[model samples]
Target: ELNDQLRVRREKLKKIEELGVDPFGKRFERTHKAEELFELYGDLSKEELEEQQIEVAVAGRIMTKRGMGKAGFAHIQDVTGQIQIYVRQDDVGEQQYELFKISDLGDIVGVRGTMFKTKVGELSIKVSSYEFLTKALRPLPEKDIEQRYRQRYLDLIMNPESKKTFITRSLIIQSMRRYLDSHGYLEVETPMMHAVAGGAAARPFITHHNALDMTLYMRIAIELHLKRLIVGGLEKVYEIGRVFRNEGISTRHNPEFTMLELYEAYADFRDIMKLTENLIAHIATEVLGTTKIQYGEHLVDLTPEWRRLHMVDAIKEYVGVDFWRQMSDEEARELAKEHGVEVAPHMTFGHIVNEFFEQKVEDKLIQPTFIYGHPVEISPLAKKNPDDPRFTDRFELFIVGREHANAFTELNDPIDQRQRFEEQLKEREQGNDEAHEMDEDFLEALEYGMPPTGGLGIGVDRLVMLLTNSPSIRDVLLFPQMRH
Candidate 1:
């Protein structure tokens, strides 16, 4: 049946061409869209609308059609939304009525008509003329299109929710850009190819440049380059760009995704906390009209004055294991076993502290949480806490049980930065390949005496997921990577 229908669609296309019509139609003059007509005259009575006789030219796909002997009604969907159109045999001429009869469900068409209400009070267009536009070579599937992620163009046309989600994604990013522009921050672009993926701890995709005869990695984060802009005396800078990671794909993970990285000179992690909350809340208000949003069964409250707690304190509350006081590597490992947390052989005191937070505390945070004071071992680029050397002055924003943003008081001392890089190399030797690579050039920038700065990295895809209320990262992303 499917193959027969497919062949018939081709037959219809040939018929359209035989009639001296361009199956791939040319410029359509659209005076109004489906949504515009409804918004203006949706509430009018049929008699009142006829008295106005509002003529409008519109173009869209034929989503639905109900044919009668002389007159019929059909719904046409444009970018804004859908509207009903009334076509009569006599009004559009016999030839045009024949053309409309053969037009397939997904065929794009143009209509010039006056607006009126249907008998049931639905706003509709009464067609005086009709033109066959683009032909749909194949039929839109009725069901079981979940596997159509690869053919997202079809999904966009067939599923209204999918189209709406992508539109919301675009608006979310636009709102962020506008919000950041209103602030005293300079938005800049950085290189996508990097000598080292120094910003975040993620496996990188490697590529070669034949001209330079050097290998480069797709940037895993916008951190180091944006931070360099700060070192050059741009007091505030931000980059919203693509970041690549060579990792397994999952509900929340994609090989390539968007990231927003920003740096502020003379600002600390605490200042970034306020900036983070305010910036996100402002975006929410701008895009969604409220700071409260619904995400997968949770009503997430994005209001400022969000909950703030130390990483160690959160661990103590959840697992009843006190990481606030000092503990040895062996002692932390034993505690992990007692609480059934996974402990690796190379795990140190700080590594174990992070493991506890990741395993026990991360997913439990459904609301907006600012988890701060991460252990020094895991935070290579963050400044060490002044009062306690074990933990760095870092924080991550969690909403809907996922890390939305990571921030830190940057470590500006060249010597300390070099030491952290060396320690990361040691971890690399111990089979953790995602450890940060030593970039001598970044250290050289630090040696020039960068001011005490705060930096932030937010996953753009994740933010879209939260604001758009998309369940999987794939739903928000138009073309997510898929396995063969």
Candidate 2:
């Protein structure tokens, strides 16, 4: 089908050459977008419209065409929206009319026309002249049959919702930048290629710098660099950038993804939680026009003062087991096996409990809720809760049963951080490739008197998906990586 379409367009291209016209013309300018034209012409009376005599040049892809011979109507789509163009032999002349008749859909054309209304009372452009802007050699997918335009690329021309999603995706990013700029949080950039990737627990994508002859890993998270800035006295800073992880791809996971990581000195996880809640709610209201958004089959309300539950409590509520009360590793492992849950043979009680929460409890949190007090085994960079050494002062915000944001009271004490890193080293030796690699340089930075801080990392693509009601992660991404 694609080859047939391409052949037809190529035939049309040859026809244009035989007609002594350039298939791809140059140096054409247009004034105003299609939506602007509607706003200017939609309210004019019939007599005024006829007398107004507004000459305009507009260019867009020809989406649809109807009629034959002497007269015809076509809808042209520009970035703003679609506008109808009426062509007649008496107006564009006999030769031009013939060319228009042979023109296929999906060809780009420029029209020099005046505004008028059709017999059916539709505001349209009355074409006085027209020219070919470009020849589309490739065929567009049939709109009636295709579900995804990303795979086909040409289906975007046939679908309006696809265009709207892209436009809204840009607007969401702009709104996020504006909101952060207004709050005195300075936007910053960090290295994408790191010598030693020390942030989140994920395998790094490895590459070598040709000039330096050294292997570099793509950053898994912006946590370490952002915290280094906090230590350097750039107190309130955030980075909205791309992060890479060598991992499995899913509805919620991508090898390369956008993240919004921010850190503020002299603040704890509690303060960060309030700030995150407000920031998320503000962006939703300002960008999407409401705090309530539809994601999949449910509506997620991102109102302020969202529900806060401890990780242990949430697991207890979802599954019938109180994991924290199970004192020993043997007890926890047996309880997991009793409930048909999987646990590693050498996993500590903390790790087993976390597995239980992630497998059974995470999906049940549909509304906006902050699940805090994560186990220390999973939170190597987080400060331990003063009252409970077994748990760290870390929280993750969930909406639509998905983790959107993660925050923690950063552990700054060099001794404690070193101990945590050593424990992670043990896990790494035990064949956990996702365990954090201990970076002595980062530990040395902490030893030089780093301040107590709070930090957060939000998955920007997932956030945009939730707010825009995008069905999949690929919908939000412009060029999502595809496997052969």
Most lDDT-accurate candidate: 1
Clashes per candidate (backbone, < 3 Å): 0, 0
lDDT of 2 by residue, 1-484 (tens): 3677677888888988798788888877887679998899987766677898788889898888899769999999898889999899999997688678867777888889999887677888999998877887875445433245335366466667777887787887888888888888889998999989988998999999898899999999999888888889988999999999898777777799999999988999999989988988988898878998888889888888999999999988989788666388888888888887787644788888788888888888999999999998889999999988788999999888889999999999999899988888888888777878888888888878779999989999998888889877877777676664
For model 1, residues 1-484, the per-residue Cα lDDT tens digits are 4888988999988988998889989888989888878788888888988998899999999889887677777889898888888899989998788778888889999999999987777888999999898999888666343575788888888788889888888888898888888898888999999987778899899999999999999999999988888889999998898999999998899999999999999999999999999999988998889999999899999999899999999998988889877688888888989988897666799999989999988999999999999999899999999999999999999988899999999999989999999999999899777788899999999888889999998998999999989889889888888785
Q: Which candidate has the top score in TM-score?
A: 1
| Model 2 Cα shift for residue 173 (angstroms) | 1.5
What C-alpha lDDT, on a 0 to 100 scale, does residue 227 get in candidate 1? Answer: 82
Q: Which stretches in model 2 have alpha-carbon errors above 4 Å?
A: 1-5, 144-152
TM-score per candidate: 0.97, 0.95
Worst 10 residues of 1 by lDDT: 140-149
